């Protein structure tokens, strides 16, 4: 639980407030670069490294079979467990582009070969979605589960725009909450399904979720329709009683009412959580830990690494986890003069 200030020797003009971080086969990749890809790297995905407290960024490549992806702003993240068919993969959908519109398309990223000369190779397969297709949105949540023992995924959360009936060119940049429907998603086929239960009182956004052994717990986020941030941590138990993919939902008592969190797994089913924002202006400050099992989710207030002042004062901030307790937080480096790198960075470790 220690923090240390890092700086990017270069590659600073290219980090937007939203972005995602994935780890697989060693190195860690940043995704969602600001604006469209330049000539430097047409992929946009960057291999990110911490070397002697400095931040280095190199380019990533692809196969021929790979299908190329635009730099989504703030999509959903999901890790496919390493097994048949191809271990391993990361499912991404769908966020919004450098322009304001949603993807409504599922993509799967995998690693292929290496090096040769310490190079890395990836590919991105789009997967068409038939149904009963889920509506386009952003900031929602997606997770992976195995029901006796078949592997599928659940989708829930996320705002969206008003339909193109009251889509008003003076509110044309307003968002509204998608109705609270759960969605079931298999990969082959990609036949998605929509479901709803009455305990799904309302949808919200930015609520981190987690799951284990085909049972899923949604944690705290924020509702806009009622301006609140309900502490209702939500349980659901999913099972494909073939061929009926039946779910059962329930409300639990305690869910932490912070929004836009940052998570790192220190082990198998343990997650240190920085958390971004508790209240409407007061950012989240504490640093929590989550264990979880069939007994339930157990919560503890771990030791918060004592922030610096310049970070303790800025309004907002963000970050990701490089993996295994390690993490990076980033603050708008609002100062004079602008470098123009407007973002300070802090490495943060557990124990």
Partner 1 sequence: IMSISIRLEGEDDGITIFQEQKPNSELSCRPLCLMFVDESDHETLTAILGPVVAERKAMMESRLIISVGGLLRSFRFFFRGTGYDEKMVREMEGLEASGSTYICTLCDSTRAEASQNMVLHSITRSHDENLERYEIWRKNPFSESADELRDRVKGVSAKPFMETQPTLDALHCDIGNATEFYKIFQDEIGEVYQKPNPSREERRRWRSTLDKQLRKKMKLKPVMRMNGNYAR
Partner 2 sequence: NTFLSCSQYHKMYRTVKATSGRQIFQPLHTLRNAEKELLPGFHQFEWQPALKNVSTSWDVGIIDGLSGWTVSVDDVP
Residue closer to partner 1 (CB basis): 39 or 253? 39
Query: From partner 1, partner 2, none, which one binds at residue 276 (CB under 5 to 8 Å depending on kind)?
Result: partner 2
Task: For residue 32, give both structure tokens.
Answer: 């969602």
DSSP 6-49: EEESS--TT--S--EEEE-SSSEEEE--SSS--SS-SS--EEEE
Q: How far is CA 9 from the centre of its chain?
A: 27
CB of 315 to partner 2, least distance (A): 7
Residue closer to partner 1 (CB basis): 43 or 288? 43
CB of 123 to partner 1, least distance (A): 10
Beta pairing, strands 141-147 & 120-127:
unpaired
| Cβ(77)–Cβ(92) below 8 Å | yes
Burial class (CB in 10 A: 0-12, 13-18, 19+), 19: buried
Query: From partner 2, partner 1, none, which one binds at residue 335 (CB under 5 to 8 Å depending on kind)?
Result: none
DSSP character at residue 53: T
Residue closer to partner 2 (CB basis): 63 or 279? 279
In 3D space, the residue among 253, 269, 172, 187 whose CA is nearest the CA of residue 220 turns out to be 253
Query: From partner 2, partner 1, none, which one binds at residue 304 (CB under 5 to 8 Å depending on kind)?
Result: none
| Cβ(62)–Cβ(43) below 8 Å | yes
In 3D space, the residue among 317, 292, 297 whose CA is nearest the CA of residue 307 turns out to be 317
CB of 121 to partner 2, least distance (A): 33
By the criterion CB under 8 A, which residues form the site for partner 2?
17-18, 73, 139, 159, 164-165, 167-175, 206, 222, 224, 259-260, 276-277, 280-281, 315-316
Query: From partner 1, partner 2, none, which one binds at residue 260 (CB under 5 to 8 Å depending on kind)?
Result: partner 2
Query: From partner 1, partner 2, none, which one binds at residue 315 (CB under 5 to 8 Å depending on kind)?
Result: partner 2
Residue closer to partner 1 (CB basis): 168 or 244? 168
| Cβ(278)–Cβ(287) below 8 Å | no
CB of 31 to partner 1, least distance (A): 16
Query: From partner 2, partner 1, none, which one binds at residue 207 (CB under 5 to 8 Å depending on kind)?
Result: none
Residue closer to partner 1 (CB basis): 103 or 264? 103
Cis geometry, peptide bond prior to residue 272 (ω within 30 degrees of 0): no
Tokens 């998603």 identify what position? 185
Residue closer to partner 2 (CB basis): 111 or 263? 263
Query: From partner 1, partner 2, none, which one binds at residue 333 (CB under 5 to 8 Å depending on kind)?
Result: none
Residue closer to partner 2 (CB basis): 147 or 259? 259
Three-class SS of 94-133: CCECCCCCECCCEEEEEEEEECCCCCEEEEEEEECCCCCC
- Other beta carbons within 10 angstroms of residue 196's beta carbon come to 13
CB of 173 to partner 2, least distance (A): 3
CB of 62 to partner 1, least distance (A): 6
Tokens 């830990």 identify what position? 289
The 3-state DSSP class for residue 313 equals: helix
CB of 72 to partner 1, least distance (A): 13
Beta pairing, strands 54-59 & 2-8:
parallel
By the criterion CB under 8 A, which residues form the site for partner 1?
16, 34-39, 42-43, 61-70, 97-100, 126, 169-170, 172-173
Query: From partner 2, partner 1, none, which one binds at residue 336 (CB under 5 to 8 Å depending on kind)?
Result: none
In 3D space, the residue among 237, 232, 234, 350 whose CA is nearest the CA of residue 300 turns out to be 350
Residue closer to partner 1 (CB basis): 173 or 336? 173
CB of 74 to partner 1, least distance (A): 12
């Amino acid at each position: 639980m220690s923090l240390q200030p890092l700086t990017a020797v270069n590659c600073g003009s290219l980090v937007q407030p939203g972005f995602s971080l994935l780890d697989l086969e060693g190195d860690v990749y940043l995704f969602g670069q600001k604006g469209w890809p330049k000539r430097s790297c047409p992929t946009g995905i960057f291999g990110v490294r911490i070397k002697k407290g400095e931040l280095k960024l190199r380019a990533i490549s692809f196969s021929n079979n790979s299908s190329y992806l635009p730099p989504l702003r703030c999509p959903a993240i999901a890790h496919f467990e390493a097994q048949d068919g191809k271990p391993e993969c990361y499912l991404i959908h769908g966020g919004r582009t450098p322009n304001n519109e949603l993807s409504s398309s599922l993509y799967m990223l995998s690693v292929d070969s290496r090096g040769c000369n310490r190079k890395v190779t990836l590919r991105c397969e789009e997967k068409e979605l038939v149904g009963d297709v889920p509506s386009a949105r952003y900031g929602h949540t997606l997770s992976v589960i195995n029901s006796r023992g078949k592997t599928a995924c659940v989708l829930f959360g996320g705002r969206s725009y008003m339909p193109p009936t009251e889509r008003t060119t003076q509110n044309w940049n307003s968002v509204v909450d998608c109705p609270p429907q759960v969605y079931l998603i298999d990969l082959e086929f990609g036949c998605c399904t929509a479901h709803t239960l009455p305990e799904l009182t309302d949808g919200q956004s930015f609520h981190v979720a987690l799951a284990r052994q085909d049972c899923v717990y949604f944690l705290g986020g924020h509702i806009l329709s009622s301006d609140c941030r309900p502490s209702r941590l939500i349980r659901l138990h999913v099972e494909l009683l073939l061929g009926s993919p039946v779910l059962t939902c329930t409300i639990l008592h305690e869910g932490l009412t912070i929004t836009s969190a940052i998570a790192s797994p220190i082990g198998y089913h343990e997650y240190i959580i920085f958390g971004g924002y508790q209240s409407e202006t007061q950012k989240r400050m504490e640093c929590t830990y989550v264990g979880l099992d069939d007994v339930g989710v157990h919560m503890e207030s771990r030791e918060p690494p004592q922030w610096t002042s310049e970070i303790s004062h800025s309004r907002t901030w963000f970050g990701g986890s490089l993996g295994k307790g390690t993490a990076l937080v980033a603050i708008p480096s609002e100062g004079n003069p602008t470098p123009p790198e407007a973002y300070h960075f802090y490495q943060v470790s557990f124990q």
